[PDB]
């Protein structure tokens, strides 16, 4: 069946280079063009660039013209998207779409077999373990807070518990909170920085 | 003399009529409303030879005649069936998907109701009332006010507005098609001169984007003439493929204008002009070209033009020049004799 | 190069309701738009193509119409599984694809009283104003904030942050409540 695979997504220094490989088994890249659509975190989808390996007619979006360099190889059934002079406002989840060829039905069907999409993030800060701060209670809501961690992946395991989405700070780091509506210990799992510090919360 | 003219009336009416009467029934067995016409015309044509109407030079037909029962039956059947056909055509023109929605046993009950609608004024008027049957003009108690009102006013008025709305709806459909194609034609022509006078790729890409959007829209729209054929017909596929290449020439012209060079974009647009006028323009030149595909208008026109004069002499006399008697049977016999030729002409 | 707009960018329909989403294309665009349903944390999936047809495998509840240069998507029923973000996308050429802002569909619920908790700062300064089990999103705390996704009894839980008293206003509260430490 049709199946698209992306890779190469991860931490990138502002001004560095990246390469995303849109592996697509099943169909052939010659048969269908491959459009790259990116979605900034918390915003709508945005078009970036397209490649049609049958003839070659690359044409990127206005904002990314020249910086990017899309390519496709039929021998590997892939459509790479070279990244050059990457900025801090280009962080998003890059999907790899498909599209038919005029004339007939395939053209009238829009981007249908989207890929999974691998996120690319750009920041000027390194990776540091969270500094869990015990949070006293006031029912009595109980929880604990973490600060100054990177990158995105982190989770809090307790022992009605909430875990609000991470919000980016003006200093380039993150901050996440949690609370359980108790009418206890705090665990944080940060795989990139392998920190498992335990925090004790008590009135 | 008078006997010779009357004698040949029955032979002309029956022999010619009965030849097509069975043929119409056989053809219909092998058009639900037309089946009624072949049936209804056959009933009073079969009983016509029983009294050849030549017993006027035999003092017969004491409790029978071709006039009262049979002519009332014939007039009622013709009027009711014509009204039903006109209403069906008007409904079909004016979006029948709500009134009927292809629900034509439901039409069989209505088809058999023509005699039921006939059996309220035609057979119910079975009485002498100083009719022919072998002061005013037969207006002491048989003034035929109801016969004229239902026979003429009811059928003519229903039919007249029915095709008037049918042709009106047809014009609005066709009108909604020529204007759309003309609008799509206008934007194709208007945007083409801008490209031929293009200075940079900033505008030659924008002009082509509008012309591509018009070609896609025009492909969905039906052509003004040469229409009504099946969507899978070769001519429809020939027209649709005519725009699958025009858009293909747009993509080739627009793709070469995306790279940055524009001197080549006009040449690709120029070769679009030579194929758009040779084939598409020729197609619409023969396009933008009335009457129904059958002879239903012909039979309806003939009947109303031959039986209205029959009742014209009914009340023409007022309380001498009584020439409406010899032509009385001839006028109605012609319509019955015109029934099978019209059916044959409709089949062609 | 064209601009595509969707006025109803936040819908609060309930189960079994009908949702109508409008989409207007600035330039002359033929019946060449599409609608995608993006479940959270997943790739978008095509729902309607060519503005009238249906993709092979979509439930029959999704239907769309054109009615001029505008475009519309109508949903007959709202099953619990069908609750995600819907995007309106046009396509005229390969290089002229523009996506709509996006329509989000959430779970309707009656107004509820927000609960506000003020957390004294840790000894190891930063305090957080907590909102727990409140609906709907139309609540603003006044002294960097982040709300959770819709919980699965269809309620939210806002959380403020400051680097004292925090107060929360809401249509479910007759008057704002102030908590101080």
Author numbering:
A (entry chain H): 4 to 141, 149 to 169, 176 to 199, 208 to 227
B (entry chain A): 38 to 67, 75 to 101, 106 to 152, 154 to 183, 212 to 366, 370 to 399, 407 to 435
C (entry chain L): 2 to 125, 132 to 150, 162 to 170, 172 to 182, 194 to 211
What text appears in the publication on this structure?
Chemerin functions as both an adipocytokine and a chemotactic factor and plays key roles in adipogenesis and inflammation. The chemerin receptors chemokine-like receptor 1 (CMKLR1) and G protein-coupled receptor 1 (GPR1), play crucial roles in regulating obesity, inflammation, and cancer, highlighting their potential as therapeutic targets. Although both receptors recognize the same ligand, chemerin, and share high sequence identity, they exhibit distinct signaling properties and biological functions. CMKLR1 is the canonical chemerin receptor that mediates both G protein and arrestin signaling, while GPR1 exhibits weak G protein signaling but strong arrestin-dependent and -independent internalization.
To better understand the receptor activation mechanism, the structure of CMKLR1 in complex with the antagonistic peptide LRH7-C2 (His-(D)Trp-Asn-Thr-Val-Val-Ser-NH2; Jian et al., 2017), was also solved. To allow structure determination, the residues R251-K254 in the third intracellular loop (ICL3) of CMKLR1 were replaced with the apocytochrome b562 (BRIL) fusion protein. The rigid connection linker from A2AAR and an anti-BRIL Fab were used to facilitate the particle alignment in cryo-EM data processing. Furthermore, the mutation F2596.43D, which potentially forms a salt bridge with the R1373.50 to limit the conformational change of helix VI, was introduced, and the C-terminal residues S339–L373 of CMKLR1 were truncated to improve protein quality. The cryo-EM analysis yielded a map of the LRH7-C2–CMKLR1 complex at 3.9 Å resolution. The densities of the antagonist LRH7-C2 were only observed for its N-terminus. The cryo-EM map of the CMKLR1–LRH7-C2 complex reveals that the histidine residue at the N-terminus of LRH7-C2 obstructs the movement of Y2566.51 towards H2776.52. Consequently, the three aromatic residues-Y2766.51, H2776.52, and W2736.48-pack more compactly, stabilizing W2736.48 in the inactive conformation.
